Amino acid sequence: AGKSSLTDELIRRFRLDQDDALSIAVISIDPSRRKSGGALLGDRIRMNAINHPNIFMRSLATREAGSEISQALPDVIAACKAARFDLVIVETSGIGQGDAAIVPHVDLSLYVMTPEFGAASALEKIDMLDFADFVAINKFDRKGAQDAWRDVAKQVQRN
Amino acid sequence: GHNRSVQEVVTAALQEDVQGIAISSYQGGHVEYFKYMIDLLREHGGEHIQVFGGGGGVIVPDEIRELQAYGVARIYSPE
Amino acid sequence: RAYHRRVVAQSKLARERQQLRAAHDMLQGAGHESAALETLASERDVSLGAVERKLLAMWPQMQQAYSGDEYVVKIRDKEIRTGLISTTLSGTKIRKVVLPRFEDEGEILKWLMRENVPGSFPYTAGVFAFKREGEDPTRMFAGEGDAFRTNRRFKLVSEGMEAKRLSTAFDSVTLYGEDPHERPDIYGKVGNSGVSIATLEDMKVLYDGFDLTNPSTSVSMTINGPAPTILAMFMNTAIDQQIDRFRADNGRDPTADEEAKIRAWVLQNVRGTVQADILKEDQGQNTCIFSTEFSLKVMGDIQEYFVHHQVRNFYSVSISGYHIAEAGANPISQLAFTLANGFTYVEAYLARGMHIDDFAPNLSFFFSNGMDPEYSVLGRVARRIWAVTMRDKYGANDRSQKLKYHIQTSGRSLHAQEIDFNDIRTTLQALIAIYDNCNSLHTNAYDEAITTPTAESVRRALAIQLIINREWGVAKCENPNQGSFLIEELTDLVEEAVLQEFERIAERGGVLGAMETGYQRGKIQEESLYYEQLKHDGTLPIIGVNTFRNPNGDPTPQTLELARSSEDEKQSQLHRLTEFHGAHQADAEAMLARLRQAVIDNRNVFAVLMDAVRVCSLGQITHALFEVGGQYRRNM
Amino acid sequence: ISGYHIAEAGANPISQLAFTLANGFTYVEAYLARGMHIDDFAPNLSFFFSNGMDPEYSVLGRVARRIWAVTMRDKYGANDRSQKLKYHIQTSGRSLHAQEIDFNDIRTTLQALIAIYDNCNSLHTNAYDEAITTPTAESVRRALAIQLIINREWGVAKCENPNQGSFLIEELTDLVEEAVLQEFERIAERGGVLGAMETGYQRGKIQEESLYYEQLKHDGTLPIIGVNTFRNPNGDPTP
Amino acid sequence: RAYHRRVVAQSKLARERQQLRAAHDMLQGAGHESAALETLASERDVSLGAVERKLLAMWPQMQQAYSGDEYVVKIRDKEIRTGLISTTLSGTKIRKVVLPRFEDEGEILKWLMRENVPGSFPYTAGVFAFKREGEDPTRMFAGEGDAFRTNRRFKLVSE
Ligand SMILES: Nc1nc2c(ncn2[C@@H]2O[C@H](COP(=O)(O)OP(=O)(O)O)[C@@H](O)[C@H]2O)c(=O)[nH]1
């Protein structure tokens, strides 16, 4: 995953540096439990940094067993665009390792990969390598961070 | 989550345009809180949302019934 | 474990030493001289340690020291003398301290290494050399609502008394530090169950006319969240009064130089205490408004400023554990967690470039005794585990090595059902606390701060303590040392258990790691659920609840509480905030920007607070801290 | 073999123990001189004495165990079952004062605990009137429950042997033993226990010590909680 | 007084005995062996008391007598078993009775001569072997007035 947290820090940096001169519209997308049919859209339990009328937040579910998104994802993205707001920030739920569905409908895609992955050279077989803007890893409370950073940089150089 | 601002709660609900509001207030003194919630809701035409409360046995039946008549659908008793 | 291993090894060494000595003493009566025994004895003595050898040689002097009636010790320029003998009703003469009758050296060395006389290393059986005399320094606590009525009550109760010790309990709004406003939600519960304050003005008016410079006076306020901010307020008031004093005596603006001299003097001389803590609240309710690390760093910076400005008498650190047991924690778990928290604070302070010898003696601890047998020895362990850690691991001052504690009764054991029995069984709690060389004893009701206005019960609450310390016969002794096995046995067992729990905590990935993972909350929940299960099942019986009920039933006629506040008081406080706000609209912005700059640039936030508090709102301060990101998030 | 009323009059602890044991030994010798063998009656003698506020009571029973036992082994060689000595302990109502009687319930707990720690053969928790001249009431529940509180739930009660971890026990034991033996020597020099009963030596000793105690009491040099100070300014209606 | 004097004398004697024992034990490691010490040990043992010597020899048996959880004793025609371990809410296991941890025989002898475990010579610490279990015989004292009234009260109480 990786939502919210980095979004939290980004939002705080934006507000603190530009004195809240930008209107951010953020939409999150969450998966749906296939068995009971329900869902748990628990991502606004995170940062309270939406407390400003100029900034809007909205949560949505996948609604689908096949994809991670609803049938109107690009349409709702354009609908968010049409409000003459400063910026659109969209979360992208979670699938396994073969999903890149958000790219064809987004200009910038900030990607994040979990520190707990080990996989000394399995990032190579991981699909989403040369399809993003900037690498992101959190939770440096564990060791081997320098090694993982170096290997990621080398793979990015190769790709 | 818990200990969330009333103004924040209502504003977020208008942001998400939700169907119901669930609150567990076992701390007491819920009368002013719920009255403020109801007034703020009726301030901006969001009456479609439903209100249900739970606070244990703090509310006597007459008091909770009066608040219910003010517009909240129910308050769920423990017993 | 290494300390104990050395103990065992040197004990065997001493046994060998006295063995060989008495051996040759007997042998010389035989005439035949085999000198190799003397060589072995010399070798054994050389292999022995030195400091322990001095301690062992001190023994006859120890015996001759306490043989007489009055103890004398001439130190520095003074000489302290004190009587050590008391008289019973039947003419039997009782020593306040009793010394071992042993003669075999090994036991002597072991006991001197594990359980010395009090007032000596390693302070197992109490820090002070002897028990202080009577006239307990029992603070009287009273605080609720506005500053005027609280000051009225303070004057009411403190009248005609020299040794003044006040305790302050603020309201919840202050603890959460949210700025009150027109909203009835915050306006409603305000002012009840505490004293609500908003600005430096109201804080000063609360403590109007009371000589904060009186050396024999103490003020202790209980709050942890805004602990930095209000602290500056207190400090500023500590200035303000005294400066105004000379304003009355001199009638002119003091010079900057003499102003600085006055500030330095009053800071050196002012006294107080704020029962502030971070770990317990985060572990207990998650009702923190700030990040744990954020608050800890702020506290460290404040300690840095205090050490830099060199105040040697006031402390604001309170490593308490009351709420942990209040939920129902197990005794050993409680002790281990408190010790871990304290040592974590010690390491954090070490990390900020401050030497150890400047803060160790200002730490404290606050925890409760229950009905389990472990409490009867708990304090013992509390002294021991700390003591050794200060000697070899860091080697702080002996005065720094000593540990002081606070003991309060546990209200969870005193259940409202059959309240009468609780008062009687509280005496059982008090007895062991007294036996363990209590440094400070509270006998409080269920509510920590008299949530309801109490009654004659406080008399009873006080009386029992007096009954023990002033008139109970056995209490004239202080040292259960030889003649009660369970003390030593349970001591060893509890020490081992606590060390093993320390090992577990270390293995679970760091103290802050456990904080992130909620290990402690889950452990406490599990054990509390087990406790309540046994309670409702009765596998562990409990008197007066599941059995021996009254056939007449328990009507329990009572009333809830009487603590109100007039709406006019709230309106007046609101417009007071309004006026103070409208006074300085241009000024607060500059201080807010400076606070931004300082927090961004890794500097002394408390320094900026010390100036902002004169001109900035508490609620504005909280919102600025939010803006910098200090808000506590929902990380369950 | 009771001495409860001896303490009730206000006797000193050591004197109480000494007089009680003197009475017991006198009965023993009186039976012995009648040509009756020892092993037929010794395990049947019983004792009845109370524990007061002074620290000696906290060890008092211990002495009663020791002094008897040795005397029964070398001097007569009775059976071991005969040699063992049984005793009774009851709360001391003298310490409880009618004034502020609410405090007496609290202060009885210390008396109870020291008796329990001494491995009593029995315990009685009794109100002021031993016969309840005024018929007692609800309060007895309390007087019972505390005993229950101590014996069924309090964990440390599972201890029965405090003997390495408190010096005062052993030291006071030796001191009390020596004092009691000295009092025995004085009694013997007084010309037999029967002679003492004739000339009233013990009455005079008890009277003198009781007067001493009352003098100290009304003086206030020796404090007594709840009476000589800390009086309620609201008066004491105490219905 | 004579009993205490005997205590002192035999205590110092036991000190002497263990002294000579450990002395010869240490001497055996140096190579030289002058046997006068063993003669002194024999003389002291002869001077040593008899019943007390048996009691001291009982000491390892005493240690084993309380090692486990329960204890059983054979007497007359039967045998009796009773448990001695208690468990706290903390899981801290508590022995009902604790024994001294001394090793030098002098203190051990004084302890065995002054204060044993309850239920042994000289019953210093308590006559009964082990604490009698709960359900104490709480008597009911009552009587006032005529015989008929007392009989009615007695019938009333013991139903
Ligand atoms: N220890 C630690 N935990 C973190 C950090 N950042 C986030 N977390 C927590 O780890 C959890 C795992 O989140 P994840 O599903 O991987 O992505 P996210 O839900 O968008 O944050 C989150 O819910 C955070 O509460 C960090 O820097 N350190």
Residue numbers in the entry:
A (entry chain C): 220 to 378
B (entry chain C): 61 to 139
C (entry chain C): 458 to 1093
D (entry chain A): 776 to 1014
E (entry chain A): 458 to 616
Provide excerpts from the study.
Although most chaperones are standalone proteins, isobutyryl-CoA mutase fused (IcmF) has a G-protein domain covalently attached to its target mutase.
Substituting the switch III residue Q341 with alanine lowers the catalytic efficiency 2.6-fold mainly through a decrease in kcat. To further investigate the structures of IcmF’s supramolecular complexes, we prepared cryogenic EM grids and collected datasets of C. metallidurans wt IcmF with GMPPCP and butyryl-CoA (wt IcmF + GMPPCP) and Q341A IcmF with GTP (Q341A IcmF + GTP). For the Q341A IcmF + GTP dataset, we performed 3D single particle reconstructions, using repeated classifications for both 2D and 3D steps to separate out heterogeneity. Thus, in addition to switch III residues residing at the interface created by the G-protein domains, they also participate in propping open the mutase.
